[model samples]
Structure formats: C-alpha cells, structure tokens
Target: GEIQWVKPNKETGRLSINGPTRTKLEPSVFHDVFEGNKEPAVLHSKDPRLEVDFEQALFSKYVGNTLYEPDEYIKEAALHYANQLKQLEINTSQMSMEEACYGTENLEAIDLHTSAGYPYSALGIKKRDILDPTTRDVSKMKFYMDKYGLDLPYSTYVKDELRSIDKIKKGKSRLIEASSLNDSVYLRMAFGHLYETFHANPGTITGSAVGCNPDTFWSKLPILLPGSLFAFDYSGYDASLSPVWFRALELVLREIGYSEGAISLIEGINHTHHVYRNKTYCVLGGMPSGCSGTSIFNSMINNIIIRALLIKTFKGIDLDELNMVAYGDDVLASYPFPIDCLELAKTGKEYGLTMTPADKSPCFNEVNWDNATFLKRGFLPDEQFPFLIHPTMPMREIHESIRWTKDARNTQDHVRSLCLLAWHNGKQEYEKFVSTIRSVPVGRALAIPNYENLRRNWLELF
Candidate 1:
C-alpha cells in the first residue's frame, strides 16, 4: 500500500499526513510516539517541551550581563556572521549531495583566498587567532561577587579556594598576594592544579572517560585490549554547540552547589573575545579553544548530561552495556542492539543541544565490518590464535605514538595517523602501502621507527 508519512514537531505534538485519504490523528497518536502503552513507557515525554524557565530564572543573576550581550558594533557584526552561518545551514539542509559538494568547493575557494578567512595552514593554528587570552578583569569579578552576595573580594576567595585544593604550593598557608594573581606563571600554575583536580574527580562519571579512552590504562600496561572498546565517533562536535545551554549548566550545578569558586573562575576566564582583522568578536555559545579550563569543563559537563539522558531513555537497560565514553563532544557508545539515535537528538534539544544525524550521529557499516573480518582472517599467521585488534585509537594515542617514534615533535602527526590506519585496517596489504609511503610529503620526512619497521617489530614482540 502506498502511503505518506509525517512526524509531529517538538513544539506542538501535532502530526499532518497528506494523501488521498485524509485522516485526523487526535489523541490516537500516543502509541505512535511512545514505545509501549504502559505505565513504564520507554518513549515520548508527557510535555515533550523540556522547558527550563524556572531553572533559568533561579540562576539568572550569575550569568546576567553575559559576554554574549555585546555592544552595538559587536552586535551588528554578530548579526552579519550569523546571517552567513544561516545561509550555510540552509544550504546544507536543503541542497542535494551533488549540489552541496559543488557549493562546498566554491566556498572553499572563497575562504582560501579571502583576507580574513581561516583555513588549513601548515604553519599551525593558534588560540590567540580565535579567542582573547585575557578575558577576566576586576570589573566583571566585582560585578559577579556583588550579585552573588559575597562579602570578600574575588582574589581573597580565589586564594582560599586554591589553598583548599592545595594549589598554593609555597611554605606556610598564608594569604596570596595581588602580585601573585597578576603573575602569568602563578595563574597558570593555579589553573593547572585546579584543572588537574577537576580532571581527577568526576562525580558519578557513567558515560565517558575523563580525558582519554577509559581503557588507556590497559595500553599503558601493554595488555591485550578488546576490539569492542573502539567504535563510533561524534562528528562536528565543536560546531554542534547550538545545543548546549549555559542556563542548563547552572541549573544542574545548583543541586550539588559545590565548587562555586572553581566554577566562577572558569566562567570568568572563558569570557573571551575573538580577534579578526582589526575588529573583535565574541562567541554567543560554545567555548572557544585556548582557555585553560575549557577542556576539563566540557569533558565534565558532556559526561554528566549524556549519562543522565541515556539513563532516562533506556530505563532498566544496563548503561554499562552501552559502554559510553565521552571526551568533550566526541561520544563513543557501544550497543549491540538498535539505539534510538533520533530520540537522543530530541533529548539534546531539551538541554539546548543539537545532535545532527549526519554529523553527531553513530554509524555502523556492515560492509566495513566484513572487510575488517576478511583482513583479520588473512592477516592472522595462526588461525586459532587471533592477534588483538586494538580499538580505534584516539588522536591522543596517535600523537603519542608518532612523537614517541621520532623523538621529535615536528613530524606530521596526521600523516603518521593515516599510516597507522592502513596498518590496522589492512595488515596484509599494509606492506604494499608502506613500500610507496615515502612518496607522500610526510612520508619523505619519515624518520627512524617508521610505520613499517615499528609495526612489524610491534607484532612480533607483543
């Protein structure tokens, strides 16, 4: 039977179907939205709005007069930038694959030649190019303290907090001087200590590993790691900041009410401006790179929210089976059964996060798996004893591997990573790839402990 299908929008749970036989789906579509018609329904929420107005109002003062609310000039520039993004978003949403490919090429050409355009450069990327280094100031600090009803100065509170965390590593537990606060080295040391502490203690971390793969400990010990450990990647994580909400963060943190000083410090430091040409720009959402606390803050926040969402969606199902590991925006969830990826997208919206299906979604290709299986079968010298298939190693692992190989930092990590990929995916055919590897730019600079020599030795020794 030929039929038309439609979905209810999140704002209004109303479905419209267009066909020869028109239908009115009143209170009858509940079953369509929910999994089962029972008390413990595994699907659609009653309200479905996921409103946070109450929460937002509660913590409104803290984030009042935020960095996003810029001056007139900045606002105009922001609008301009936003319009550009809007067009790109529209094009991506509506354009066909072929059209998009051509459009992307055109955009790339324009971006490459444009004076202010940011493009891939071998000279390397810098944080100063995207964000301001010094965003925190006395005025903003004073404003926050006054609003939060704090009697003490920001510095006094910071020193006390640092002392509690053992960040102040001097002789006696004394008062921190203003000079020390102004000193870049001192501030960095303090920031580093705070970051390390936060990185260490993630309360009830159910979803992702702290900074690296939770299984990195195994790699350190030279143990055989499981294949199931590495799979699934959250693409365009940085670009997908349209979903994460500052208000949501404040609301969640209000319950625990811990690390107030630490949180304030991070937020203060994060309030930075982007410098392009002669003008300055600020990000409306998504913390830019270069902030000392950004990585740790993102890792913690993503883990907490993702874990909660997963639990809410799949009740009674062991979340451990999901094997969820989040690092910043890169989420890797391993599940044997079918997962409601669309449901996850819906959940993200409630929290002001967007999970794009093509970008931030999970993908499992049976064809690739089959090829991997075939390659494994052929590569295994002994059929009974299968060589360990290392899980898809993260960029951190690749960087470590390449740097360790050359005893030099300048060797192209990206190229080395590609060689490693070829080695892992097609071990049998890897020799042919390696034989002609030196022809490439990075391959020409291939030093001792090259991919071929290292991998061959690694196989035998391990």
Candidate 2:
C-alpha cells in the first residue's frame, strides 16, 4: 500500500524498498520533494544537488492525497495584486475577452500535444492521455468549448553558464520556470493573437486603442519606435508575482468581457495538486515548471505595465519617440537619452515588481558593462581576445559554443556548427578548431551513431 521509488522500462515498471521494511519513512519523507514534482517553478532552486533531485523527480506520480501547506502571506499577496489589477479602470473597449483569450483554430488543434517527451500536469495527473477520442465520446476541453463557449486559459538550459562562470556568489536564483499545460495554452493564445485579429495590419496599430494588452504588432525589437540606447531587463521577473498575478490576469479576462462561468470553469482544470505523505495540497502560487506559456501571459501583462512605464518616463520628452521590444519579461527599450533606472526601479514597485540596479547604462556593441571599471573599456566582457560583436556567431562566441557541444558530447550538433564556423570565418578559424573536434572520444563511447552522416556533413570544409 506504500509508494516508494518507481522505476519503469519499456512498458514494464517496478518500485524500490527501504532497508528490508525494517525502518519507516518519516512523516515528512515526501513533503517538499513531492511538491517539487508538481511545482517545478522552484524545482531545482530548493534542491541544487547534482543528483538527488534528478533521481527523485523521475519517479513521482499522479498522487491523490488531498493534502499540503502554502505560505499564507504569498497566497494573500497574490490575491491583493490580482484585486489591485482589477481596480485599474483602463477602458478595454475594442478587445473582447473571448477574442483575446483564444483563436478558433487553436481550440481545434488538440492532437498537437507530443507527450512521450515532456511529462507533468497542473492538475496533478500523470501521463494519462486525456485526449483519446476512442475511450471517450468527446474530448474534455471541447466539452467547455462547444457546449459552454468557455475554454479555460491554462497556466531552461541555464546549466551551461555554471561551468563557464566557474562560481556563483550569493547570486539570486538565475532561473524561474513553470509547467507544460501553462506552456501550450499560452502558445495557442499567444500566436493566435498574432493572427489577423483586431490588432491586424500595420496601418491602424499606430493609432492607440484606449486599453492595453501585449500586442504582437507592438513588440518590434531592435527598433520599436527607434532610439540610440538600450535600457533592458527585469530581474527575477515571473518570480515578481506569484500564481496570484496569473490569477489577476484571469480576472483581467473577466474585465475584458469573458463570462464568469468561463473563468470559473477554467479554475477547475487550471488548479494543480501535490501529495505529501497522506495529504493532498494544490498549488496556490502559479503554474510550476513542466506545467509550463507563461511567455504569452507575461508578454501581455508585462508590456501592459512596463510599456505604460516607458510612456510615463518618455512623456516629459518624446513620449512618442521611445522604442520598446518586449519578449515576455526580457525587455529592450531605446531612447535618445539614457532612461533613469532609479525612477523605473521605484515606479515598478507600486505594482509589486522591482527593477533593481537600473540596467540603463553606457553599453558597447549590444552588450552592457554596467558595473565596469572606467579603465576596463576597449576590452570586451567575457573575452580572451578582442570583442567580436558584429559577425555571424563570432569566433570568440563559437569557441565557447562548440566547447559546449564537444565537452557536453553533442558531436552531431558540434560538427555541423564547426563546419559553419569554418565556412563563415575562413580556413584559419576552422583549422584552429580541428584539433578540438578530433579529440572528441570515438572509441570508448558507443561508436558514434550515424558516423557517416557526421563525416559527409564536414567534407564541405575541404
């Protein structure tokens, strides 16, 4: 009756034992770890061990014990932010919530899910094919879509920097992530909004609508409104708000004219749970990682707020002149004069967000050295040689990149990348890396799969 380590192989599975059943697990044995399985947003942050999390994470299942605890303060604050967002009386006249929340085509493309790869749910269920048309008369989300007209809005790779930087010093958590359901829903909603919608065509977009949401047409980076300097980034962005901001966004849908029933219906599926020992606890924070489209949600809400802040800052000068390109929370803005990071930092707090260190600064060639010694100019950041900013994936960057592919043992990707490097930077550059490429282990490792393909792909360098 007890669940222990579950191991699966080729459709066969097994579990583990704890010392011949002599000793029992503590009441807290499954506490934090199981929750980590569901709330992947803070998955590795709590447990940074190299292997413990990696092992435990693979075995957690669709647990059904209605139990867990949440930080009461975070839960309350989330509601506060959501309620506060509701009070903003911005006139959302032209955009209908039904129109903004989804597109007709997205609602139909259900089989687009490929689950043997990614695994997790906001609803605390395991790899259950909720989309099977054979077992059920109709698909689940479709029940709401066709019958009630209410489809619910559902709710990486940073490790490479670890070896390069060599060490971290009291650094804030460098990454924040959410779950798969949240990811696909927003993917649908995000690009769907991009299609021919009310925000259609370049002509009418220049004229402002009375209200705001992130507009696909408005997020033109490199040149949104055109300027000379870049003031970008929001540190610890999604972490800025808890699941509460997401809930507030859902409420914003209500403000935009989606029905209360639709919103309530979404809550049923949107809610996720975790089982600790014997109790089941649902997530109060937000979509946890693996339950991950926060991009689309964050894009609209982020631009909705910061774009307004940009207007406030530039309003005194050329309110019409500021340019901004926001991709989720990673922001880029160019102004004729440097923006006051201090002011932006302070103003952002009123909404419970912070913009610390005032990233606005003297930059060279698309990179910022905000904390540079005046004497440190001319040399580039993270360089052994001269800065290489303008070329196609410059040599300095290539060296580090292929090292990632090589040392990381992705020779297939590495060889192709190296060939491109030789092709672009010339024979001298290719020869420089030839030794590095050849050193990749070929004997002990499982003889390179598709070694022939790896060979033919590089012959172009000759």
lDDT per residue for candidate 1 within 1-462, as digits (tens), equals 000122223322222111112111122111222122111111111213323332222112122122322333323322332232232222111222122111222221111121111211112332223222243223432333244332111111011111111211211122111111112221233334333333443222323244432222213211221223323333333323432333334333333332454334334333322222222233334434333334555554555545555555666655444444445665444454656656766665554454554322244432122222111121222223343333333222322222222224444554455465555434444554454445355555665235456456545644
How many pairs in model 2 have backbone atoms within 3 A of each other, for residues 3 or more apart or on separate chains, i.e. clashes?
22
Summed backbone clashes in each candidate are 5, 22
- Winning candidate number (TM-score): 2
Best-fitting candidate, scored by lDDT: 2
lDDT of each: 0.33, 0.35
Score candidate 1 by TM-score against the native. Answer: 0.42
For candidate 1, the lDDT comes to 0.33
Q: What is the TM-score of each candidate against the true structure?
A: 0.42, 0.46
Model 2 TM-score relative to the real fold: 0.46
Off by over 4 Å in 1: 1-194, 197-236, 239-258, 269-271, 311-322, 335-337, 350-352, 357-387, 391-422, 438-453, 456-462
